[PDB]
């Protein structure tokens, strides 16, 4: 049995607040910079299909 | 022209021709000596080596055909100081030989040992 190098200490990430991009004032990109996770176009479209409007907003 | 290190040999020897005699071309490799000594794909044994005798009689396969070739029989005239062509009439065209042969070195791959190679 081989122990792979994709350990869970290198994969988890959480942000409450933190740095923001200066020209958009949106959360930064990346884990090592303590940024956010992107809810993309497809996720937005999924949120529209449910009808959960305030979730989308 | 005239090349450095080359001599124009002005003394050659005659090449006679006149039921009548016929001329052939024979090609040999450089590993057979020619000092010591009608058919298709013959063979002969010399220098304990397998010798192949292929007669690649091109053009002349279809009887006489047009008889156009890519080589000439260069002959001495009655001066023996240059190279000239010869024929049988006033055709002023090259006269290819009546046959041609080629010799090729031959080996013999030993027949494979099926019994000793098909080990279960």
């Amino acid at each position: 049995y081989q122990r792979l190098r994709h350990m869970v200490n290198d994969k988890f990430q959480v942000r409450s607040t933190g740095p923001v991009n200066s020209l958009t004032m949106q959360p930064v990109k990346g884990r090592k910079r303590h940024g956010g996770i992107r809810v993309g176009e497809m996720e937005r479209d999924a949120l529209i299909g449910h009808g959960t409007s305030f979730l989308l907003q | 022209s005239i090349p450095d290190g080359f001599k124009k040999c002005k003394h050659l020897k005659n090449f006679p021709l006149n039921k009548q005699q016929q001329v052939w071309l024979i090609k040999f490799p450089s590993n057979v000596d020619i000092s010591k000594l009608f058919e298709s794909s013959t063979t002969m044994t010399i220098d304990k080596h397998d010798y192949k005798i292929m007669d690649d009689t091109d053009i002349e396969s279809s009887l006489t055909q047009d008889n156009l070739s890519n080589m000439t029989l260069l002959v001495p005239s009655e001066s023996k100081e240059s190279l000239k062509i010869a024929s049988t009439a006033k055709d002023n065209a090259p006269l290819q030989f009546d046959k041609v042969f080629s010799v090729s070195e031959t080996a013999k791959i030993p027949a494979i040992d099926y019994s000793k190679v098909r080990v279960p």
């Binding site: 049995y1 122990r3 792979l4 | 080629s102 070195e105 030993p110 494979i112």
Partner: protein, 730 residues
Amino acid sequence: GLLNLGVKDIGEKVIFDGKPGYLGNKLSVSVEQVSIAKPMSNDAVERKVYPSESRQRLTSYRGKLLLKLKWSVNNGEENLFEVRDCGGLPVMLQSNRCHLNKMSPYELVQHKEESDEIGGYFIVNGIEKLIRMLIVQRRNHPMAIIRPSFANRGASYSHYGIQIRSVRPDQTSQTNVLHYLNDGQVTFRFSWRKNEYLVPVVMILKALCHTSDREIFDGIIGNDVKDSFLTDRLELLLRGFKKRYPHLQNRTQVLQYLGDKFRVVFQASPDQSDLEVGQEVLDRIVLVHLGKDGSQDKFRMLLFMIRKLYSLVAGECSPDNPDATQHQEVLLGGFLYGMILKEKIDEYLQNIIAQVRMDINRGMAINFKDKRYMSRVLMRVNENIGSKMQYFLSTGNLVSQSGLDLQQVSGYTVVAEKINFYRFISHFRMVHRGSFFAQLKTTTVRKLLPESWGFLCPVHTPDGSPCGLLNHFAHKCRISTQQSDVSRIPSILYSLGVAPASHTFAAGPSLCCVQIDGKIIGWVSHEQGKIIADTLRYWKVEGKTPGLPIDLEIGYVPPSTRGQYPGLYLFGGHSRMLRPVRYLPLDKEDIVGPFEQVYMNIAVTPQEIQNNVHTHVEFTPTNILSILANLTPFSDFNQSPRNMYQCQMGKQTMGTPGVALCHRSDNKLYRLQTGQTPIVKANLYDDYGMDNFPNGFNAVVAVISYTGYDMDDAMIINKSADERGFGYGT
């Protein structure tokens, strides 16, 4: 080596000065020898530099690049030879120009490297790099290609052609294309610098050698004069050339026109007759694999290429697969280093000539025969070729000047990651089809052709985007890196029954043309060609005849009904793929190649041999895999996607990368504190000696559904075992 041939073929860069049909006071700079000193340090007498150096201190393991540039004035008047350094060129490990070339494991342990360390990687800026081995077209082989993209070149541009590469003896290649036009003429095509030019083929044919036009007729239409397709096409070609170039009556005139056309693109000096620059373009563009003095050769080669193009048009042959292994070779990585160094030194010569031209424009000092003037001019230019090459290795991008027949630009050096020993070994066997095909849509390049039997491991290929594009080599795949002794091969092929190239009026698919290294030798029939091929292998595998090298593969293609174009194609060059195999008559280790084997009956194991069918038997069926594919236990009892997943996983295994981790400074390394040998190991776990880097442990696995915490793909470890050191690592 190759770096003397490269500077030899670079030539000389001529320039005249601006004060006196007196052209000026000539200058001709060049290089005749390039010296690569082994890496040393200036801390007097230069001590030896060891690769643990520049790795401990986060630097580069670069040697010194010094070249003997000349400064000749006018044809041996006052030649001012002078060597001068050009900055520290990065050099790899375990190569001759490195201080571990011929050492022992004991002293290797002493030198703080590793116990059985291997190189292949250049240490640039404290990071190990690696020149990936790309896979390119077979050199010196005219392969008929059908591409609808050849139709895009304009109207009357049929989508047929004949593409051939040709590599210079310094390992640099110039490719050629022979497009076929619907009107009837065929236009030779080539590229120079970073631009493309097209030329009618007959002008090239008469430029190469001075002979009659009837010779072209016989060299394309050999003995099929009773045919009509070829005769009509050739008449179109010849009459079109005559009516489009009415005043090119002889070779001198055609070369004169070629030189006039190609004068400023090549930056020819004013002391360049048109008859001279035409010859220079001719000898440095067309069929470069034949080199100079072989114009009489390139003539017959181009005639054969035209005839094969006609056969491709007429449906007498088949469009050879360019993405099948039968028509591929691999550039060796160090040869990319050689090509880029040669282009850099060429550009350095161009830059010093530019500096002299700036001197003419402003400074106006013409003392060419003054070494003080030479010192003044030379010290102005950028000489750090070593810095340029270090940039190249560290960034992967290629700022070249002529492309060197490479389809891509970026992505040539990858990082030799030392996450795991399996990853490390994996790097030095992978083959990349090129960054060109990564951006694409057609799957047919990603297929698994049967031509790659025992060359590219069918299992080892990373799933995802690079699937089929990054296929590793079989662990018993040898890549020839030396030219073979072919100079005596014609000497024996003639006596075997081959009429040589000259005085041979015969062409077409009906006869077998014998070609070595892309050079035509003679023409023989098909049955006799088969006999000759088998006789050659018979004499070759037994090493009695010194003139038949082991690596010489003899590709023989029998006559076929509209199959592949025939011709006994021999090869002895570099860059090829080779595989050992047995030869059933008088068994002995025989070396085969991808082009060669597609007509050989190679039984997988000796038990499935048949009467007069098979002639070769593989040593072991396990040799078609890579190392990481032979390491998977009981592979024949798994689904192939699972084998591929295993090969991808073992390259991501957290285990011991090495034991010299004391004397390294890599950014991030994972090691397993306690590793175990596998009980269920392959036989090659000991041939390659992988006991030094245990990647895991022998775990008691229970195939049981008991906890519920492992259904889709999860698994459960023992808490106590985990607490007794199971799989621990830092």
